[PDB]
From a paper:
They form the basis of a highly cooperative, concentration-dependent genetic switch involved in both activation and repression of R–M genes. Here we present biophysical, biochemical, and high-resolution structural analysis of a novel class of controller proteins, exemplified by C.Csp231I.
The calculated Matthews coefficients were 2.38 Å3 Da− 1 (one monomer in the asymmetric unit) and 2.01 Å3 Da− 1 (two monomers in the asymmetric unit) for the cubic and monoclinic structures, respectively. The following analysis is based on the cubic form of C.Csp231I. The striking feature in C.Csp231I is not that the dimer interface is larger, but rather that 75% of the dimer interface is contributed by the extended C-terminal helical region (helices 6 and 7; residues 67–98). In fact, the five-helix bundle that makes up the main conserved domain only creates 310 Å2 of buried surface area on its own. The analysis of B-factors in the cubic crystal form of C.Csp231I reveals that the extended C-terminal region of the protein, comprising helices 6 and 7, is significantly more mobile than the rest of the structure.
Author numbering:
A (entry chain A), B (entry chain A): 1 to 96
Write the structure that this text describes.
């Protein structure tokens, strides 16, 4: 997991390390210590935990794994496009 | 990691489970057994291993973590766009 992606997305959500961890199913007593390990890159969550984090954060989960800043922006923005404008840009890309 | 993403990308590369594992730094004696665990979803690699896999497979690493088929296609295709056509579609998206 890339730590900047997790931290940026948490701060956009307006929630603390603890609340993110508790909503993602970490025991309350461990939640802030565990989230801080993740956010400092001390160790990384399993994919199942990342999905729970992404659902709390309302982002596509692969945003957390995208090292390319410009691709990460596409992911984050796509997340808020309608079905017409998704399929729109889909075929901008499907020609390449 | 999503197993379909890893398998699709390996088969596009034209290489076996063993060769993928060996190039990604797994010991030769374990390489095919380990890769098959990953591809069957029996357990999942750490992010550092996923990055080594992605570099062998010549894909952006977050392709392996993207459950949305249409977003995964954007990732895969972006991977083969030039700097002008990357920045092109960048601003198709930056207006949203």
């Amino acid at each position: 997991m890339l730590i900047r992606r997790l931290k940026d997305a948490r701060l956009r959500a307006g929630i603390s390390q603890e609340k993110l961890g508790v909503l993602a199913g970490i025991d309350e007593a461990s939640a802030s210590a565990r989230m801080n390990q993740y956010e400092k890159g001390k160790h990384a969550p399993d994919f199942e935990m990342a999905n729970r984090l992404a659902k709390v954060l309302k982002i596509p989960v692969s945003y957390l794994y995208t090292p390319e800043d410009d691709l990460a922006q596409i992911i984050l923005t796509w997340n808020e496009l309608n079905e017409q404008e998704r399929k729109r840009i889909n075929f901008y890309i499907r020609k390449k």
